[PDB]
Automatic annotation (TrEMBL), chain B:
Name by which UniProt lists this protein: Vp2
Lineage, highest ranks first: Viruses, Riboviria, Orthornavirae, Duplornaviricota, Resentoviricetes
Full-sequence range covered: 806 to 855 of 955
Species per Swiss-Prot/TrEMBL record: Banna virus (BAV)
Amino acid sequence: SKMNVSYRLYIKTPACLLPLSDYMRAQHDYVSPSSSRVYIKDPAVVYTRS
Amino acid sequence: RFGFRDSPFCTSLPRTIMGNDVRRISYNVFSMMEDIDDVISEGFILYDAY
């Protein structure tokens, strides 16, 4: 590394990388709606009896 | 007059029953009624139709 490499390139640390110690920063919450919900596939029909 | 059992014929449709005027509902309103179960308990007259 010291003798056989001539030039080096440096960039800001990508934010996607994360050390193993900071694994709790990856904790996140996702919400799924209740399974009792029923989604209608039938259209509404409009009528009058007058 | 005719001696019928439980005669369905009245000389005239009564104006008052038990001291209160009999409710009159047009056929169109009765067709669209969704609280029909509460109405029939008291009794009513249907008109505006043949």
